[PDB]
């Protein structure tokens, strides 16, 4: 019935207090699934490639480059962080691979290409580098390319900078192969993939008087198929669907997805735990999924007044919201992702737990990404969390959970049953049992 | 000969007028000759009316061109800048190079004072050092400019009735002879009368006070009135403080602050102003607005061509 998940690989340092530069901040598969790129808080993007021999090969290091460097905002005297927020792959145009990497202020387009030949030959200098006699040049010679060991080169092709006042939190590529959007806390800009000196501001929710702000943009994404539909969520728990056909400026929303709040759960933190940290479109495009702090909501695009399905990621932390507020654990921005057939959704949790919900069977599994079972092809044992006391046999007590071990970033293989789970420092890859 | 260098300096000026940096050798020669000219320059330079007084520019070259459009072009219009030619600007190098070239070519027409932001310590932090490193790849030009910055006059006097300076008065300063007695051929100190003259600010609080900038002192109306009565000064010009309307009166028309950078830091959206002194010492302020430029990537709500 359920999918048997087996430990496959682990990447990163082993049992060390890692500095705040090797912490993985984004994980993303490419469109065909054979490339897996991870970014960290140091601005260092690492790309893994699947081995070629279903495809159940391993992932090995393929390329490494420094995406963003530390920078200083001379205009305001603030340090600009080099942390990589989002990484988005582009559809394969040719033998090279392209991706968009963004820090808080700048989006960069990087090209990854393989070079396997080197020019050999010269007319005025020996191959070593010594300068030959200038009077020995009697016949001209043209350099001839020679095969060499394959090497992978990554270079930046275009820089999209100096356009966002606030911190960029989302980038999404349009389905027309031409444009993409970048959304900061208050504005959404539409870019052209080959034009960097101008951008089109389609959405602007910044009030003229800013001392009555009530919400900010937290996520944004284009429709996977439609070229005119995109959504963006707010900190108040509402998702606005904008149609770009109606008008040039999308300041008015075509649809508004929100759930009325019952005063039963009208607690002090009811405004924080209702903020949406991630919005994801299903692969079919007929469904949309949002993640707040405590739950995962799946929305039907034809129904606006309530979601069709709601899953509780971790209910045991509802009664401990006050404790999580003290140590700033209530402000975490978790993410979520669909599987290939839009039937299973996986999202992260605390204590190195990631949850998986099956839409067809309404079944829940909790798994642990830990090094204690570092044996390949080993079935992960499902985990169950119990309240304070009644620890039965394998029940993990709530008070024993480690809130410093958060799984914020997860990815799914677009076609296979391979998931990448990023802990604080390590990157875990799990595969289906075959 | 002097004539060939005169045409060379002129051609440098027209080249700079369209935002074109000079070569390292050209910058070296210009800085050397400016140092030669400024060596005999007094601490309190006598400026003769008429003259147009300008405030901070902070590297906004296009706003400097707008200022020249509003107030006229040198040497037709006599100018008097009050420091802060660099930092927090996209074209600090071009701005300071053009100003130094104008000073060398027209030493009797344009007078440039010294502010807090032209120093080795400040320029290393606020981007001028980074700007010259990114545009040249070496610190030689930075060294030339920072060496030249030491020779800039601290203050200026206009007909012995108007006193122009960047920061403001100092607790240790009571007479113009005290300023004339100082040694300005040095790096900006963290304390002392020289530091206060480039870091002080006016305030409504009586007497003196502490400045939140990290240096200098804040003086009240009583201090300004006492200084005016002691030195016989009708007015005290000032700069270094951002004002929204361009020029701001304070201390009962004894201290006036002039800011000449419209849209300060490309985000404040403020107005700039310049004070024009008539032949009869009749002050008159001309406010202007930022020059219309497309800008670094133009975020517009008008549909661009690629989307149209």
């Amino acid at each position: 019935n359920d999918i048997q998940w087996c430990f496959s690989q682990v990447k990163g340092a082993v049992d060390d207090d890692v500095a705040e530069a090797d912490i993985i901040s984004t994980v993303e598969f490419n469109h065909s699934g054979e490339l897996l790129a991870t970014g960290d808080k140091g601005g260092r993007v690492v790309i893994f490639q699947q081995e070629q021999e279903h495809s159940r090969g391993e992932y090995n290091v393929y390329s490494t480059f420094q995406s963003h460097e530390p920078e200083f905002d001379y205009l305001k005297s603030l340090e600009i962080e080099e942390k990589i927020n989002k990484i988005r792959w582009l559809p394969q145009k040719n033998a090279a691979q392209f991706l968009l990497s963004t820090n808080d202020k700048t989006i960069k387009l990087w090209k990854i290409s393989e070079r396997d030949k080197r020019p050999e030959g010269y007319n005025l200098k020996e191959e070593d580098g010594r300068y030959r006699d200038p009077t020995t040049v009697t016949t001209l010679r043209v350099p001839v390319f020679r095969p060499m060991d394959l090497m992978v080169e990554a270079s930046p092709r275009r820089i999209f900078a100096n356009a966002h006042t606030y911190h960029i939190n989302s980038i999404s590529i349009n389905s027309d192969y031409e444009t993409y959007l970048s959304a900061d806390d208050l504005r959404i800009n539409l870019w052209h993939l080959e034009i960097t000196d101008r951008s089109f501001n389609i959405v602007d929710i910044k009030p003229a008087n800013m001392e009555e702000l009530t919400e900010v943009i937290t996520a944004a994404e284009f429709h996977p198929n439609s070229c005119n539909t995109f959504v963006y969520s707010s900190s108040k728990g509402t998702i606005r669907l904008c149609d770009m056909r109606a008008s040039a400026l999308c300041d008015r929303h075509s649809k508004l997805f929100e759930e009325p709040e019952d005063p039963s759960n009208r607690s002090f933190f009811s405004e924080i735990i209702s903020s949406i940290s991630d919005v994801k479109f299903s692969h079919s495009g007929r469904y949309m999924m949002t993640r707040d702090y405590l739950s995962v909501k799946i929305w039907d695009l034809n129904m606006e007044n309530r979601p069709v399905e709601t899953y509780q990621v971790h209910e045991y932390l509802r009664s401990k919201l006050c404790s999580l507020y003290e140590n700033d654990c209530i402000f975490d921005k978790f993410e979520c992702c669909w599987n290939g057939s839009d039937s299973v959704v996986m999202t992260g949790s605390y204590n190195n737990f990631f949850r998986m919900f099956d839409r067809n069977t309404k079944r829940d599994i909790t798994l642990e990404a830990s090094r204690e079972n570092n044996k390949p092809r080993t079935v992960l044992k499902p985990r169950k969390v119990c309240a304070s006391g009644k620890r039965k046999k394998d029940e993990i007590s709530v008070d024993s959970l480690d809130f410093n071990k958060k799984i914020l970033h997860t990815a799914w293989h677009p076609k296979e049953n391979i998931i990448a789970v990023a802990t604080t420092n390590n990157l875990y890859i799990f595969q289906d049992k075959v | 000969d002097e004539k060939v260098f005169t045409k060379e300096l002129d051609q440098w000026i027209e080249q700079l007028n369209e935002c074109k940096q000079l070569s390292e050798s050209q910058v070296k020669s210009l800085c050397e000759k400016a140092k030669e000219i400024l060596t005999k320059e007094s601490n309190v330079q006598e400026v003769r009316c008429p003259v147009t007084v300008c405030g901070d520019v902070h590297g906004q070259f296009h706003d400097l061109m707008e200022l020249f459009r509003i107030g006229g072009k040198s040497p037709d219009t006599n100018y008097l800048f009050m420091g802060d030619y660099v930092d927090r600007g996209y074209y600090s190098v071009e701005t300071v190079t053009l100003l130094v070239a104008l000073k060398v070519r027209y030493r009797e027409r344009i007078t440039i004072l010294r502010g807090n932001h032209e120093s080795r310590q400040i320029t290393q932090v606020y981007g001028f050092y980074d700007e010259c490193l990114r545009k040249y790849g070496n610190a030689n030009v930075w060294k030339y400019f920072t060496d030249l910055f030491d020779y800039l006059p601290l203050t200026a006097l206009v007909d012995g009735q108007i006193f122009c300076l960047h920061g403001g008065l100092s607790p240790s300063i009571d007479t113009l002879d005290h300023i004339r007695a100082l040694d300005r051929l040095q790096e900006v100190p963290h304390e002392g009368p020289m530091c206060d003259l480039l870091w002080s600010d006016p305030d409504d609080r009586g007497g003196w006070g502490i400045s939140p900038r990290g240096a200098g002192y804040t003086f009240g109306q009583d201090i300004s009135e006492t200084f005016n009565h002691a030195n016989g000064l009708t007015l005290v010009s000032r700069a270094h403080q951002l004002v929204m309307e361009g020029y701001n009166w304070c201390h009962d028309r004894n201290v006036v602050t002039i800011f000449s950078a419209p849209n300060y830091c490309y985000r404040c959206g403020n107005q700039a102003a310049i004070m024009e002194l008539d032949d009869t010492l009749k002050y008159s302020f001309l406010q202007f607005d930022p020059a219309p430029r497309r800008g670094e990537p133009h975020v517009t709500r008008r549909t661009p061509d690629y989307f149209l």
Binding site: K76, T214, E215, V216, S235, F269, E271, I272 | -
Partner: peptide, 21 residues
């Protein structure tokens, strides 16, 4: 009286003090 999201207050305060000297 629920408290506001941290991003809202951070944006508000950062944009408020844009004339610091």
């Amino acid at each position: 009286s629920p408290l506001m999201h941290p991003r809202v207050k951070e944006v508000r305060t950062d944009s408020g003090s844009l004339r610091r000297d």
